[PDB]
Amino acid sequence: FNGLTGTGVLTESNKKFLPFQQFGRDIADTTDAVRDPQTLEILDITPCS
């Protein structure tokens, strides 16, 4: 996603990103959610089991 590489399951989020926010992080500084560059929807990232 926009140069941010990773592996996981992209579900659909209830997160409400502000217009200036593209990606979110957790306490471990791993991207927990990203914004799709085209449809502008918030996807929840969770690495595979």
Next chain:
Amino acid sequence: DLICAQKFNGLTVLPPLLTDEMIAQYTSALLAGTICSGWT
């Protein structure tokens, strides 16, 4: 589904070999032995 952040960084939690429902049964057996027999 989603669990936690610790679980997702290699930090797993192993269940105990003795579940609580069987530790409680061990305790109940000890109590019954104390009541029926005593220290014998």
